[PDB]
Write a protein that binds this ligand. Structure first.
Ligand SMILES: Cc1cc2nc3c(=O)[nH]c(=O)nc-3n(C[C@H](O)[C@H](O)[C@H](O)COP(=O)(O)OP(=O)(O)OC[C@H]3O[C@@H](n4cnc5c(N)ncnc54)[C@H](O)[C@@H]3O)c2cc1C
Length: 474
């Protein structure tokens, strides 16, 4: 026969899926597939929490396809070899999938497509994870943006796309077809343990399309109205917690935008309106960094701006280790690192703090931090993670004047009552917020909690000194 294969990667859902919808308009014999790629799964940068969330998403996706009328095929191996082989064995009319913005995915995709073209099989690659593709947002000179402001002004004025239809009444494969591909398939979805992973720390939102959609709806129904200023406080549960759903596509970007937009139209309060616009802004920042990675792939290599490619990083392994183990002695920093390692998620204000701390205070090549975050974030995303770490030094996009966060000031400003500190550092619940914020704790009252591993003021001067010496040397 002539079925169409849809290749899932970061769009683990049946609803509001550009590529899937386009494929369904071409054939009802729509068969989904997912390939466990060893280069990604065996990577030292793979987070256990991310594999757990992913596996949970795949489980639901299997059901969705089954309920739709067909199935989700599962494979394990090199994509450019297995996908074309599968398509050929199935004499596929075509293979569809949504475009990636990352170096690895785009290179791989080019290879799969070329392999398919050689086999004489059509490959269709459409944009789905962004409201606007990188090629849609360009300046008057037709160039990409490296500064947020102007990018936002353009992006904001562009007509927003709406959710596409969920495919239905699919036609499943026949025994003869199933026999032709048997050797390429896994008999069942491997469990987290079978893959060699273990995770018991939970998630910001339960895995799956259904849970993602429920969270989006619940958030936009209430919490979003207070997004600003509730977003600034780690102690408050003021954010959506949809990050992993967006990274793995458990939710469609158009559904997200439409939900927020409908909430803004329904709201009759200026403050709420503003809160919702602010949340929408976050989605814009998301596209700013994704577009940036797309347009400037070298960003993924580390410090982008020339000066920073030459920064004299101290790199004291011991300080890094202390940082990864939440033993820095800075309460606000340790409480954040603990939440990360224990739950695979961290409040953005906290990520900004620990990143600033690692880069500015500990003076460690921020790539070590970027890597550590990727090894633990359930939402670990190259574009966003790299953007965040380039940000800790203004070494990439949207650069700002040299600046160093003061842990105490941030803590006092965003966790004034030390509620968040106490929450993740229970062995310090007896200490007074006053001291947890200043980071100056008396030994006895400190119990086993380590003392600050560095003197902020001395580190601050050291960093500025190196910066200036280099700035001058250049
Ligand atoms: C050093 C550091 C590393 C980071 N690592 C990642 C990462 O690997 N993956 C990840 O998706 N985000 C990352 N962020 C951005 C950010 O902290 C999160 O997206 C956020 O914590 C997600 O929580 P939420 O879903 O409740 O966000 P909400 O506030 O509800 O925002 C909604 C959505 O907007 C997007 N978003 C929000 N903040 C930004 C931003 N600053 N940059 C890019 N997208 C944004 C996310 O997709 C998010 O789910 C990083 C930030 C820093 C400073």
């Amino acid at each position: 026969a002539a079925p169409i294969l849809f290749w899932h990667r970061r769009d683990l859902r049946l609803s509001d899926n550009i590529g899937l919808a386009a494929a369904r308009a071409q054939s009802a014999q729509l068969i989904g597939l997912f390939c466990l790629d060893p280069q990604i799964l065996q990577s030292a940068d793979m987070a256990p929490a991310r594999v757990a969330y992913l596996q949970g998403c795949l489980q639901e996706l299997q059901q969705r396809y089954q309920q739709a009328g067909s199935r989700l095929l599962l494979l394990q191996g090199d994509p450019q070899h297995l996908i074309p082989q599968l398509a050929q064995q199935l004499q596929a009319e075509a293979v569809y999938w949504n475009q990636d913005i990352e170096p690895y995915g785009r290179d791989r995709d080019g290879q799969v497509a070329a392999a398919l073209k050689t086999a004489g099989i059509r490959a269709v690659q459409l944009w789905d994870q962004l409201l606007h593709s990188p090629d849609q947002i360009l300046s008057g000179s037709g160039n990409p943006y490296s500064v947020y402001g102007p990018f936002w002004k353009n992006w904001q004025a562009q007509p927003k796309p709406t959710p596409v239809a969920t495919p239905t009444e699919l036609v499943d494969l026949s025994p003869e077809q199933l026999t032709a591909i048997a050797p390429l398939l896994l008999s069942e979805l491997p469990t987290l343990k079978q893959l060699g992973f273990d995770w018991d720390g939970g998630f910001p939102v339960e895995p799956g399309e259904t849970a993602a959609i429920a969270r989006l709806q619940e958030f936009c129904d209430r919490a979003i109205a207070d997004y600003d200023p509730q977003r600034n406080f780690p102690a408050e549960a003021g954010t959506s917690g949809l990050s992993p759903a967006l990274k793995f596509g458990a939710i469609g970007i158009r559904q997200a935008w439409q939900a927020a937009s409908a909430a803004h139209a329904l709201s009759r309060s200026d403050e709420a309106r503003n809160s919702i616009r602010v949340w929408q802004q976050e989605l814009a920042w998301r596209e700013f960094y994704q577009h940036a990675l797309y347009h400037f792939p070298s960003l993924a290599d580390g410090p982008y701006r020339s000066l920073w490619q030459q920064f004299p990083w101290e790199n004291r392994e011991a300080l890094f280790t202390a940082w990864t183990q939440a033993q820095t002695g800075y309460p606000i920093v340790d409480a954040a690192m603990r939440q990360l390692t224990e739950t695979g998620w961290m409040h953005n204000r906290c990520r900004m703090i620990v990143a600033s701390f690692l880069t500015k205070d500990l003076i460690i090549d921020w790539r070590r931090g970027e890597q550590f975050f990727m090894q633990h974030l359930v939402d670990g995303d190259l574009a966003a993670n790299n953007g965040g770490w380039q940000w800790s030094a203004s070494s990439g996009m949207d650069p700002k004047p040299l600046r160093i966060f003061n842990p105490a000031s941030q803590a006092k400003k965003f966790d004034a009552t030390a509620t968040y500190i106490k929450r993740w550092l229970p062995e310090l619940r007896h200490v007074h917020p006053k001291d947890l914020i200043s980071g100056e704790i008396t030994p006895i009252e400190r119990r086993g909690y380590p003392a600050p591993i560095v003197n902020h003021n001395l580190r601050q001067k050291q960093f500025k000194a190196l910066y200036n010496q280099l700035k001058a040397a250049i």
